[PDB]
Each structure stands twice: as C-alpha cells, then as structure tokens.
Amino acid sequence: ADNLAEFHVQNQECDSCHTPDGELSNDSLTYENTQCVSCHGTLAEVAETTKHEHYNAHASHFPGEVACTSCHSAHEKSMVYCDSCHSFDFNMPYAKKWLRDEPTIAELAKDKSERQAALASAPHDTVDVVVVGSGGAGFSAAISATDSGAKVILIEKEPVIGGNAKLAAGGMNAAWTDQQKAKKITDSPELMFEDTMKGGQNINDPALVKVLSSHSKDSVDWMTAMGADLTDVGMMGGASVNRAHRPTGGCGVGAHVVQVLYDNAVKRNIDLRMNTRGIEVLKDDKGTVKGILVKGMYKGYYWVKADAVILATGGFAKNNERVAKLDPSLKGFISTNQPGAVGDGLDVAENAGGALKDMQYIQAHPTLSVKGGVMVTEAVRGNGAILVNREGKRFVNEITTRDKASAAILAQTGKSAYLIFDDSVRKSLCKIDKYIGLGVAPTADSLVKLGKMEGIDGKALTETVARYNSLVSSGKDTDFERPNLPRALNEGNYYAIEVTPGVHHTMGGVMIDTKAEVMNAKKQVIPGLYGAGEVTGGVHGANRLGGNAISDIITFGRLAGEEAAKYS
Ligand SMILES: Cc1cc2nc3c(=O)[nH]c(=O)nc-3n(C[C@H](O)[C@H](O)[C@H](O)COP(=O)(O)OP(=O)(O)OC[C@H]3O[C@@H](n4cnc5c(N)ncnc54)[C@H](O)[C@@H]3O)c2cc1C
Ligand code: HEC
Ligand code: HEC
Numbered sequence: 001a002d003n004l005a006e007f008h009v010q011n012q013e014c015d016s017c018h019t020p021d022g023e024l025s026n027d028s029l030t031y032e033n034t035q036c037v038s039c040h041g042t043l044a045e046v047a048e049t050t051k052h053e054h055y056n057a058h059a060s061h062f063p064g065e066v067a068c069t070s071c072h073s074a075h076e077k078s079m080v081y082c083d084s085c086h087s088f089d090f091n092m093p094y095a096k097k098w099l100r101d102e103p104t105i106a107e108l109a110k111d112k113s114e115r116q117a118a119l120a121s122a123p124h125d126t127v128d129v130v131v132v133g134s135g136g137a138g139f140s141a142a143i144s145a146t147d148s149g150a151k152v153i154l155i156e157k158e159p160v161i162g163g164n165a166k167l168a169a170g171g172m173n174a175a176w177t178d179q180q181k182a183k184k185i186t187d188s189p190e191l192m193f194e195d196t197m198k199g200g201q202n203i204n205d206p207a208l209v210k211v212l213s214s215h216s217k218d219s220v221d222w223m224t225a226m227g228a229d230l231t232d233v234g235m236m237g238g239a240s241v242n243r244a245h246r247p248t249g250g251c252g253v254g255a256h257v258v259q260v261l262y263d264n265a266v267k268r269n270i271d272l273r274m275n276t277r278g279i280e281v282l283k284d285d286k287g288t289v290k291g292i293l294v295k296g297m298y299k300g301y302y303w304v305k306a307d308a309v310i311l312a313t314g315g316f317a318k319n320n321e322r323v324a325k326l327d328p329s330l331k332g333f334i335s336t337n338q339p340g341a342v343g344d345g346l347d348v349a350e351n352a353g354g355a356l357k358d359m360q361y362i363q364a365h366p367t368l369s370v371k372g373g374v375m376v377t378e379a380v381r382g383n384g385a386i387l388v389n390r391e392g393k394r395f396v397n398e399i400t401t402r403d404k405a406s407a408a409i410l411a412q413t414g415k416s417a418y419l420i421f422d423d424s425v426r427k428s429l430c431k432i433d434k435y436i437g438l439g440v441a442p443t444a445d446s447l448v449k450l451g452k453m454e455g456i457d458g459k460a461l462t463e464t465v466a467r468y469n470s471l472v473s474s475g476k477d478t479d480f481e482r483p484n485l486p487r488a489l490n491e492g493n494y495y496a497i498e499v500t501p502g503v504h505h506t507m508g509g510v511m512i513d514t515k516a517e518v519m520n521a522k523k524q525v526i527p528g529l530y531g532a533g534e535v536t537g538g539v540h541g542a543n544r545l546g547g548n549a550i551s552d553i554i555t556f557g558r559l560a561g562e563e564a565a566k567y568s
C-alpha cells in the first residue's frame with residue numbers, strides 16, 4: 001500500500017476511522033484518533049510493542065496525550081515528529097523524511113480568497129479570551145483567565161502541546177521560596193532582580209524585571225498548588241545563590257510543568273485546539289480587539305469573536321534566517337528549539353499594530369551536544385561539572401553568563417569544548433542520565449582513558465581535574481574565579497560531553513507593559529491585546545539568565561490571563 005488508509009481499507013470500511021457523514025471531527029482529529037486507539041490501544045499500550053533499549057517512538061519525554069495523527073497521517077505519507085531533533089533508527093510505515101515548510105504569515109496573504117469568505121461568515125465561536133500557543137505562558141494564561149471567570153479557547157499550531165517549554169531542563173528561578181528555605185538557602189526577590197539586571201547588561205526594562213522577581217515566589221506557589229514538584233533548587237549561571245527550582249533529584253522542569261498545566265487545563269474543560277494556527281488579530285472600528293482569524297489544518301479558515309487575544313507564541317530561535325539578519329554571528333548555528341519556533345507570532349503581533357523591541361539580542365546556549373544536536377543543561381555545570389578544551393585545560397568560569405561562556409567555548413580549538421564530570425555529579429542531577437541514554441556521554445574509569453577516547457590530552461586532563469579538585473577543597477577558584485564549587489570530581493567513573501553553542505532564546509519581541517498589554521510604537525496600549533512569554537521583549541535584555549524563562553512564562557502568562565479576563 002502507498003498510504004496508511006489504503007492499508008486499512010483492504011479489510012475495513014471508511015467509517016472504521018470516520019464519523020457517519022465523513023466530515024473530520026475538528027482540527028485536533030479527536031474522533032479519528034479515538035478510533036485508532038479503539039483498535040490499537042493508547043499510546044502507552046502501543047509503546048509496549050515498539051521498545052528499543054534506549055528509545056521508543058511511542059514513549060517519549062513529550063507531555064500530554066500525543067495524538068496518533070501527529071506522526072501517522074491516513075491518506076498520505078507522513079513524518080516522524082522526533083526526526084525534527086533526533087535521528088533514531090525508525091521504520092514507521094508510510095514514513096517520509098522530516099521537512100518543515102510552513103508558510104509565513106505574509107505568504108498566507110495569498111489566501112485572500114478563503115480568508116475573505118471566512119471573515120464574511122458568522123464567527124465559529126464567541127468567547128471571552130483566545131490564547132494563542134500551548135507553551136507554559138499560554139497554558140498559564142488559559143488557566144488563570146478560566147479561574148477568573150472567562151471562557152477561553154486555547155489554540156496550538158503544532159500537532160503536539162508544549163512548545164519549547166516542554167523541553168526545559170535546568171529549572172524555574174524564584175526567590176525567596178519555601179522550597180529554598182527547606183534546603184537552607186538564603187535569597188531575596190531583590191537579589192534575583194539585581195542578578196537579572198546585571199546579567200542582562202542593564203538593558204532589561206526594570207519595571208518588567210520587578211514583576212519577574214516580585215511575582216516569582218507566587219508563581220512557584222501557584223504551580224505547586226496545581227501539583228508541581230519544584231522542591232529541588234539548583235545553581236545556574238550568573239546567579240548569586242541557588243534559585244533554579246525543579247523536580248526532586250534534579251529531573252527536567254519543563255516536561256513536568258507542561259504536564260501539570262495540561263492536566264489542570266483538562267480538569268477545567270478548557271477548549272484546546274491542535275493544528276490550529278493564529279493568523280490575524282481582528283480589530284473593531286476603534287482599534288480594540290474583536291477576535292482572531294485562525295487556520296485549522298483540517299477544517300480551514302475560521303474566526304473566533306472575543307474581547308481579548310493573548311499572544312503566547314514563543315520565540316524565533318529556530319528561524320536561522322531571521323536570527324542571522326539580526327545577529328550575523330549566529331548564522332549557520334544549530335538550534336535547541338522545536339521546529340515551529342520561527343516567529344510567526346511576532347508577525348501576527350506587528351500586523352495588529354504591536355511594536356517590537358530588543359530584537360537584536362539573541363542568546364546562544366553555550367552547551368549543545370555536538371554528537372546529539374540537543375541542549376545539554378546548564379545544570380550539569382551548576383551541579384559541578386567543568387569545561388575543558390582539547391588541550392585538556394579549563395578555560396572559563398563555567399557558571400558565568402551565557403554570552404561569555406559561549407564566546408569562550410567558540411574561542412577554543414575546534415570551536416567546541418567538553419563537559420567533564422564524575423559519578424558524584426551524575427548522581428546529583430537526574431537529568432544527566434538522559435544524556436547517557438542518548439549516547440552522548442562517553443565514560444571511562446580514568447581521565448587518561450577518557451582523553452584518549454575523546455581526543456583530549458589525557459595527562460593534561462588528569463592534572464586539570466586534580467588541580468580543580470584542589471581548588472574545590474581550598475574553596476577558591478584562583479584560576480577562573482568560579483564563585484561556587486559544589487563538588488569534587490572524584491567519585492567513580494568520569495564522563496565527557498562534547499559541547500558547542502547553539503541558538504536558543506530570543507530576548508526581543510513584542511513590547512508589553514507590566515500588565516502584559518501590547519503597545520504600539522507610540523507606546524499606546526492596543527486594547528484587548530496581550531503578550532506573554534518568550535514572544536515578548538524587555539524582560540531579559542541583552543542576555544537572559546538560565547532559569548529565568550520558565551519564571552517569566554508562568555508569571556506573565558498568569559498575569560495576562562487575569563488581566564484579559566478583567567478586561568473581559
Ligand atoms: C531545550 C530547551 C531547554 C530549555 N530550558 C530552560 C530551563 O530549564 N529554564 C528556563 O528558564 N528556560 C529554559 N528554556 C527556555 C524556555 O523553555 C522557553 O523560553 C519557553 O519555552 C518560552 O515559553 P513560551 O510559553 O513563551 O513559548 P513556547 O513554550 O515556545 O510555546 C509557544 C507555543 O506557541 C506556538 N505557536 C507559535 N505561533 C503560533 C501561532 N501563530 N498560532 C498558534 N500557535 C502558535 C508554538 O508552536 C509553541 O507550541 C529552554 C528552551 C529549550 C529550547
Ligand atoms: C488511526 C488513524 C490509525 C492509526 C494511526 C493506525 N491504525 Fe491500524 N490496524 C488495524 C489492524 C487490524 C492492523 C493490522 C495489524 C494488526 O493486526 O494489528 C493495523 C495496522 C496498522 C499499522 C501498520 C500498517 C502496515 O503497513 O503494516 C499502523 C501504523 C496503524 N495500523 C496505525 C486496526 C485498526 C482499526 C480497527 C478497526 C482502526 C480504526 C485503525 N487500525 C486505525 C489506525
Ligand atoms: C483510518 C486509518 C482512516 C481510514 C481507513 C480512512 N480515513 Fe479518511 N481520513 C483519516 C484521517 C486521519 C484524515 C485526516 C487527514 C489524513 O490523511 O490524515 C482523513 C481525511 C479524509 C478526507 C479529507 C477530508 C477533508 O479534507 O475535509 C477524506 C475525503 C477522506 N478521509 C475519505 C475517506 C474515505 C472515503 C475512506 C474509505 C475509503 C477513508 N477516508 C478511509 C482516516 C482514515
């Protein structure tokens with residue numbers, strides 16, 4: 001058979017998958033996926049049949065309930081979503097090679113016919129607030145607006161929830177939390193504010209940073225009340241004290257937070273629509289929001305009538321063409337991002353009259369795995385790993401800010417470096433076992449053997465770790481002035497991960513005020529239009545601190561949902 005439907009129809013009727021009249025149920029394909037599940041089992045049940053030692057197409061780190069049709073289309077060959085970041089050896093029936101070619105908002109102007117028809121029609125729904133994007137900011141806005149008495153529709157353009165937020169590792173920054181106090185950590189919102197402003201080269205809007213620092217404990221409390229575990233508190237770069245909150249043992253914060261948000265949205269019966277892209281914010285004759293034109297992948301264009309629209313669409317770090325025009329030093333770099341993080345939400349914001357700011361400030365994460373092409377968490381360094389070059393020497397304070405760390409790594413021989421750590425570090429950070437599972441953390445019982453394995457000077461490496469451990473013992477790094485030396489690298493075996501910078505986060509975006517209201521170039525509020533999360537500019541300035549993006553998206557998403565509900 002040339003496609004999945006053709007295979008099935010050999011001994012099944014059309015209505016084995018389809019509704020009675022044949023119409024597709026909705027853009028989430030709810031009815032149709034339910035039919036797949038009726039015969040094949042849930043995703044977890046299918047996964048039992050497709051195990052590999054170190055990976056499983058049907059059991060991944062993605063949170064929520066991942067629809068079968070995310071990867072298996074019926075009437076045409078389809079792509080494995082995992083192929084957008086990994087190259088696992090898969091044999092999905094009716095597969096085709098991964099290729100993302102999504103039309104820009106500007107290109108969709110070609111749908112002049114179809115869009116005019118939609119807008120000429122009755123609104124498909126009439127609600128209070130539409131939230132665009134199912135990352136942490138969008139789910140937070142949808143939940144908060146719903147709890148404030150608003151009727152919400154949440155849309156997501158991708159087939160799966162969670163955006164980049166589901167990928168978050170190292171943590172959510174906050175001070176001064178119960179969780180920190182329980183771990184004998186002393187902090188303050190003031191110190192978080194100070195670290196943040198300094199970290200951003202004082203480019204950040206201080207009014208927005210004050211919201212970030214002052215609301216941070218409340219946001220940790222809010223997540224925790226919803227069921228999140230944020231009890232482990234680690235160190236990230238450019239921070240005065242440990243304040244990156246994450247689940248027990250140092251497991252990934254992002255999948256967890258997104259799962260909690262998803263479960264809470266399902267509990268509230270929030271209308272979530274997948275494969276549904278926000279295209280154009282609609283405004284009335286006085287320039288206030290009146291709704292939004294969307295494009296359903298399966299059901300076509302339609303509009304929703306609403307008082308408020310909350311853009312929670314994330315960044316553009318996947319779009320290297322747009323990135324390179326703003327910061328040429330990042331041209332041709334690999335990205336840490338999900339395939340849809342291309343900035344189409346900003347185009348929607350600008351078309352609605354929103355001004356952008358700080359667009360030139362784009363962060364490279366200092367440590368993408370060269371072998372795996374995925375982010376390796378800064379928490380590996382926070383929990384005690386060092387960086388060495390091919391000469392086997394330290395060369396940077398491994399917990400400095402990301403601008404400085406990235407530059408340092410790029411300055412080394414081969415424009416890459418190695419994370420080096422032992423089993424004490426490994427055991428301290430649950431997330432590290434994921435890199436071992438991915439195959440990107442080669443190991444040996446001596447540094448000489450590891451060095452020979454990886455092309456690092458083995459004797460120099462050995463002497464480097466001895467010297468470093470000496471500095472840990474004496475309590476002062478006189479070589480690179482690293483201010484926190486949590487662990488000696490001296491238990492069990494040693495690991496190396498080859499790392500290099502990758503494009504990671506866009507600090508610029510739509511201009512908002514402290515109420516998450518989008519403003520035009522005249523600094524005038526556009527009534528009914530809100531922005532929250534990485535889509536906004538002004539929060540992070542010239543360099544974002546690790547841990548501060550998850551803090552941002554929960555704080556600003558929650559605030560936006562409450563403000564939108566009040567606005568009405
Ligand atoms: C691998 C990785 C690890 C990270 N780790 C951390 C960490 O631990 N700590 C931290 O603070 N930050 C971390 N970050 C940064 C942080 O996760 C991102 O800043 C965060 O995901 C921003 O969340 P968001 O809700 O604004 O956007 P996202 O989570 O990216 O969600 C936006 C969603 O909107 C969608 N969308 C876009 N346009 C449209 C449209 N027109 N219509 C409908 N939907 C649309 C997307 O497809 C996406 O699903 C990490 C980022 C990555 C990539
Ligand atoms: C909804 C769109 C789906 C999806 C994503 C899949 N199916 Fe089915 N399927 C059914 C049976 C009896 C078979 C033969 C194998 C078996 O005995 O279990 C299949 C086969 C598949 C495949 C493999 C195709 C190939 O080329 O070998 C795949 C990838 C698959 N399915 C996914 C039974 C049913 C149903 C019962 C009436 C329904 C409904 C579906 N399948 C729908 C779907
Ligand atoms: C499950 C395995 C299916 C079988 C068997 C049939 N269809 Fe299907 N159909 C299915 C899905 C998941 C979808 C969405 C797109 C995709 O290919 O994944 C569709 C789509 C259609 C459409 C398009 C409808 C539209 O664009 O509005 C049509 C016209 C259609 N399907 C017809 C159809 C007929 C006549 C079938 C029996 C021969 C049939 N389908 C089988 C899932 C499945």
Ligand code: HEC
Pocket residue numbers: 036037040041042043046049050057058066067068069070071072080081082089090091092093
């Ligand atoms: C992408 C992330 C997928 C999603 C979501 C679902 N499936 Fe899948 N499927 C995918 C791959 C890459 C493969 C090949 C796996 C491999 O290890 O090579 C498959 C395979 C199947 C199969 C065939 C299994 C077999 O016995 O050989 C089936 C029957 C199947 N998938 C069904 C299925 C259903 C019902 C899903 C929703 C619950 C579903 N898949 C999700 C990729 C992805």
Ligand code: HEC
Pocket residue numbers: 054055056057058059060061062081082083084085086167169252336337338339374375433434435437438
């Ligand atoms: C980029 C946006 C990704 C996509 C798409 C998928 N994964 Fe992933 N994966 C990504 C990262 C940054 C990491 C590093 C470890 C971490 O948890 O942050 C990984 C790791 C894995 C691993 C190894 C660890 C583990 O969970 O066992 C596996 C087996 C894995 N990823 C599988 C996987 C599958 C099956 C996916 C499709 C459903 C998938 N990944 C998508 C980033 C990204």
Ligand SMILES: O=C([O-])[C@H](O)C=C([O-])O
Pocket residue numbers: 168169170171365375376377378379505545546547548549550
């Ligand atoms: O390194 C991480 O875990 C991460 O990627 C941290 C942030 O904030 O972006």
Ligand code: NA
Pocket residue numbers: 315506507508509533534535536537
């Ligand atoms: Na931004």
